[PDB]
Amino acid sequence: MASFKLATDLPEWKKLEETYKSVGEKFSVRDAFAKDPKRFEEFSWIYKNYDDSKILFDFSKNLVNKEILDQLVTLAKEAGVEKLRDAMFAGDHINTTEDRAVYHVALRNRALRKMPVDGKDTAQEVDDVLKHMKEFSDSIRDGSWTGYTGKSITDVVNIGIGGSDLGPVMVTEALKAYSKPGLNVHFISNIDGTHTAETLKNLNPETTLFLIASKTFTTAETITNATSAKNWFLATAKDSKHIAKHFAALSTNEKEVVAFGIDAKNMFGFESWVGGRYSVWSAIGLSVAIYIGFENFNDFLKGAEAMDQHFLTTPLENNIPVIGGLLSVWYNNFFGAQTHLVVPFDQYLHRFPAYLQQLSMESNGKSVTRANVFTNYQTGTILFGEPATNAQHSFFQLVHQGTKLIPADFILAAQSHNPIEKNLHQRMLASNFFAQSEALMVGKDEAKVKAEGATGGLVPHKEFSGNRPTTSILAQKITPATLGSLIAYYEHLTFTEGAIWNINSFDQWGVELGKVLAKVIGKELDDKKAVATHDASTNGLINQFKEWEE
Amino acid sequence: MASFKLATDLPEWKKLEETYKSVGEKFSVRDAFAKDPKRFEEFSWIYKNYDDSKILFDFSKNLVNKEILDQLVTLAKEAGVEKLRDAMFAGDHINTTEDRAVYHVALRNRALRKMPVDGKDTAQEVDDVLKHMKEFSDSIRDGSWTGYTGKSITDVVNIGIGGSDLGPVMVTEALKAYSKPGLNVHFISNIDGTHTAETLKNLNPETTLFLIASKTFTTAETITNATSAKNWFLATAKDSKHIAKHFAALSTNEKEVVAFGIDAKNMFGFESWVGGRYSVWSAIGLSVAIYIGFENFNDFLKGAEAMDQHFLTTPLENNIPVIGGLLSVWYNNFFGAQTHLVVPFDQYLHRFPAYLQQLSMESNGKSVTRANVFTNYQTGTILFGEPATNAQHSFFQLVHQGTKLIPADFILAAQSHNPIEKNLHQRMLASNFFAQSEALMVGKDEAKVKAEGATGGLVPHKEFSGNRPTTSILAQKITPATLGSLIAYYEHLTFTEGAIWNINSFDQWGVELGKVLAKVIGKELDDKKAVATHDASTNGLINQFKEWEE
Numbered sequence A, B: 001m002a003s004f005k006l007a008t009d010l011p012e013w014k015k016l017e018e019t020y021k022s023v024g025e026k027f028s029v030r031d032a033f034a035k036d037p038k039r040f041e042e043f044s045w046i047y048k049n050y051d052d053s054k055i056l057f058d059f060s061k062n063l064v065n066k067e068i069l070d071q072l073v074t075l076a077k078e079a080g081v082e083k084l085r086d087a088m089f090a091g092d093h094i095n096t097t098e099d100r101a102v103y104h105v106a107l108r109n110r111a112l113r114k115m116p117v118d119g120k121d122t123a124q125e126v127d128d129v130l131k132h133m134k135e136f137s138d139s140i141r142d143g144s145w146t147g148y149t150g151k152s153i154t155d156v157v158n159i160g161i162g163g164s165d166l167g168p169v170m171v172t173e174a175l176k177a178y179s180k181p182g183l184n185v186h187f188i189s190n191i192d193g194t195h196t197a198e199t200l201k202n203l204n205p206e207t208t209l210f211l212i213a214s215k216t217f218t219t220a221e222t223i224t225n226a227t228s229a230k231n232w233f234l235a236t237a238k239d240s241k242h243i244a245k246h247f248a249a250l251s252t253n254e255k256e257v258v259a260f261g262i263d264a265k266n267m268f269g270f271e272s273w274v275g276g277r278y279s280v281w282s283a284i285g286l287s288v289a290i291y292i293g294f295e296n297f298n299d300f301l302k303g304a305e306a307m308d309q310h311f312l313t314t315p316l317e318n319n320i321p322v323i324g325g326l327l328s329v330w331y332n333n334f335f336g337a338q339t340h341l342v343v344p345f346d347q348y349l350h351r352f353p354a355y356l357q358q359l360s361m362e363s364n365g366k367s368v369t370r371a372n373v374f375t376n377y378q379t380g381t382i383l384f385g386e387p388a389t390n391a392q393h394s395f396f397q398l399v400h401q402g403t404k405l406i407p408a409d410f411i412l413a414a415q416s417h418n419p420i421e422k423n424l425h426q427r428m429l430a431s432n433f434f435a436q437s438e439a440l441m442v443g444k445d446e447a448k449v450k451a452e453g454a455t456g457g458l459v460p461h462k463e464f465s466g467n468r469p470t471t472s473i474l475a476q477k478i479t480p481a482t483l484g485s486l487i488a489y490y491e492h493l494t495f496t497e498g499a500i501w502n503i504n505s506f507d508q509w510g511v512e513l514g515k516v517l518a519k520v521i522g523k524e525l526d527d528k529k530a531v532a533t534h535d536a537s538t539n540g541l542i543n544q545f546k547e548w549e550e
């Protein structure tokens, strides 16, 4: 139970509103650098990972100074961010609406610290699943697990949706440099039959392995997809005994897995206290272990663990995910910026924004606090993004010259996995990273536009305001460990935001509703009659569909 | 030159502010349907395509009624939307800042209407490029254009970025059902050397054709990529005489193409008046014509042409792209919603939101009007999305239960290209389409939550406000023609928004800045000394990079 009801009840909230009007609204980043020669040092932090690799988190181009950050830290203290964090790590049931622990941090407890739920350590139970994952993924990779005709597996198809899909997708794409030729992964997720048809069309049943990924093992889309995949498999295999070499399950529900025809020995389990959008660290990450090997997957976990330790043990004023979360609150609640842009200067990370979009928005898109009252202040932001340099050629127009503040995170690795042409591409990429954040800060004034040759009415069109904020995140290399730390950064940022707003970051009563009105209409689409059971728009759309369907 | 300075000073703007306060803010969509039994008919329009196929645009779950829509139409008349549209179609130089025509509509002039720029008809000149495109794409597909060892082309690699990349990507993905076995397309765009390395590593130089897609033929990323691709090609082919069978260009700049080593005969041309984000209809679409055949590409153009005719000839109150644009203004400028969500219930259309994100934000992210003064009101929204059903399990939590208004467009085809399992998947997909928009409108009140079994503090967490607006777009089938119409709808919606805001939707001075910013720093990355020529953050980031680079 909550120590306060509303974020607006915390004394520092009004003080921040007043600082916004006196200092924040008209904040000049150019002036801040001129006032404070040490600003880069003061507003950048080096994170050291467990493997002694490093990531620089530079917040110094944000609309923040010492006064503002000190106030945000006081707000975090008033909100009990540390109390809630500590309860999370203690295994307390801080998912109050589902009455569940929130223990993705236990999934990556590779040190085997005591991490109890309901007074019982989880360290060994988690480790045992990882050992099963190692054994199975090793046998897929070395050919000792063969298909029904005695061939090594060449293609692994994950079937799942939401938290049972997007993490596997994003992480296999991100760490594809660590894959091996001849072993491919695929991801079926949409119920749209296109997804199944296009994915399976050119695969060989004899050498394809399915992972059916579902926490509940009841999700409409996933079980239907999995059934259609089984039918494809059997169209060639022509005997149900062959299923056992070709289908495994990633779930919390052993009874429903067995009911589907998968042997319990090929179920990779996890617990209720793993949220889908926090699940890639669990059995749900099996596709990643198969694609890049268990040891790389373990390194990914250890990266998360090291960031967890940083979050747990660091005073707020130097705690990197907390700082990111405080700046998000600053922009969301005081500037009224509705969005948060994440731009990886990295093609492997092309699905990173999409993954973070689920993490962030599904966590923090809430209107009710832990005191069970409605928020009349803003909660979760809308997170979006695409990789650079492409984004620079497209919606960066609006980032630079539009009327909306869009706080932005830019991410670059100093070293490429693909340093082709003697690192020419990489140097060009990095130059863009530095130059874009610089430009967003410094802008281009009327005098400069004139000096560059514009006259008369053209001039204002070529001006740039500057003072457009960015956070720059520079890693040495996007290894498994680094990616693990980067995701955990955003997990704990998300945590911080939710703690300040006093929401439950860990339920999802909208995604849960997502299965009820659809079943009602599904049955109406199976009947022949025109429908009149809904509002006129829903009826009209259904009836028009009925006239146009096959 | 403009007939007004600022949208806020059009007479109807202050009237719409008063209507927002009195009727708009607290608008009840449920009450609207109860008051008007004909609401679905009054606020939905069937669009008829040139091939007699249809698309239903249902706006009736929006926060709009006759009073509001009539005021928005008056606003459009005061802003001179029709006069600017007519000037666009006349070939006038409405891109005032670059002194260019805006003539993507001429690209899809299959009717060969008189469409002049600078007083000279473009119809035959456009048509002649399309004839070249047909000839070449036919020759790729029929194996008469062979590689340097006499083999059919199997892989076509477009190299380009932004406007020269995202349309080809999105449309080849969208129309993949119309492709043929054994002829694949790929898209290199990022400067990041990963993009080139991963795309080329398993292709055969003997059967790979490159299209270098660049309006200017000077873009740094594209020319660098193209050079690296030529190096890869020559590593196997050895003799540069073989380049003529493997490299073609899509460009306005013949001199630079020929300087690169591409024969002028293998340039597919277009003109200055094609903006990149409006360019897939031009030579830039050659990869589409190769992948799906010229006839399908031509059908795509004819769908756009039909929607152009609708936009040109329809009174504002019944003009479908104008209505969409008026609603956008309503939400952006009166409700203060910063975002616009686009969700295709269609996996083929997975890259459709990203394409629209460029179209929309790059067009309308501006702060200066055609009277060359700064705005005192919001312009372009932030457009985002992913396909459903994935999105329902990603971020729809926030759409349903968060604190932000997010106008959403949902798109479904009645018929799938892949009606597997006797259309089971398709019926399930459709059910979701109808149910999600219904749910966003109806919500779920406190009493219903109690009736469903929640007590005490759990109750508010399970409430849904409803009155969350959607637009539903139901097509018969996403054919080439349908997709052409759909993109043109969003082009003309974008046009409408910009016309009301009095901005130039057709320049992109932030994208142009980005293309000259990186070279300065690139030269500093080539020296190995530490740098102190910038602000302390930019210096700090460059210097840390230098410490960490290979």
Ligand SMILES: O=C(O)[C@@H](O)[C@H](O)[C@H](O)COP(=O)(O)O
Residues within 6 Å of the ligand: A161, A162, A163, A164, A213, A214, A215, A216, A217, A218, A219, A222, A275, A276, A277, A362, A508, A511, B393, B394
């Ligand atoms: O975030 C969520 O809870 C949803 O995306 C789930 O992750 C998705 O609905 C799949 O649920 P399950 O894993 O139970 O099949």
Ligand SMILES: O=C(O)[C@@H](O)[C@H](O)[C@H](O)COP(=O)(O)O
Residues within 6 Å of the ligand: A393, A394, B161, B162, B163, B164, B213, B214, B215, B216, B217, B218, B219, B222, B275, B276, B277, B362, B508, B511, B515
């Ligand atoms: O929208 C734009 O203008 C950009 O995205 C361009 O398409 C991109 O910069 C590539 O330009 P070009 O086609 O001249 O290579």
Ligand SMILES: CNCC[C@H](O)c1cccs1
Residues within 6 Å of the ligand: A129, A132, A251, A252, A254, A264, A265, A266, A267, A268, A269, A270, A271
């Ligand atoms: C072989 N599978 C064992 C699964 C294990 O019992 C579980 C772990 C977590 C939930 S269920």
Ligand SMILES: CNCC[C@H](O)c1cccs1
Residues within 6 Å of the ligand: B129, B132, B251, B252, B264, B265, B266, B267, B268, B269, B270, B271
């Ligand atoms: C064979 N290529 C000719 C290209 C033609 O001249 C052009 C058309 C549009 C711009 S340039």
Ligand SMILES: OC[C@H]1CC[C@H](CO)CC1
Residues within 6 Å of the ligand: A196, A197, A198, A200, A201, A228, A229, A231, A232, B420, B421
């Ligand atoms: O073309 C591949 C497709 C896969 C799913 C089956 C399901 O019956 C149909 C064939």
Ligand SMILES: OC[C@H]1CC[C@H](CO)CC1
Residues within 6 Å of the ligand: A420, A421, B196, B197, B198, B200, B201, B228, B229, B231, B232
């Ligand atoms: O591995 C494929 C890669 C492609 C680009 C060339 C550029 O030199 C290097 C090899």
Ligand SMILES: [Cl-]
Residues within 6 Å of the ligand: A128, A129, A132, A267, A268, A269
């Ligand atoms: Cl297990």
Ligand SMILES: [Cl-]
Residues within 6 Å of the ligand: B128, B129, B132, B267, B268, B269
């Ligand atoms: Cl041509």
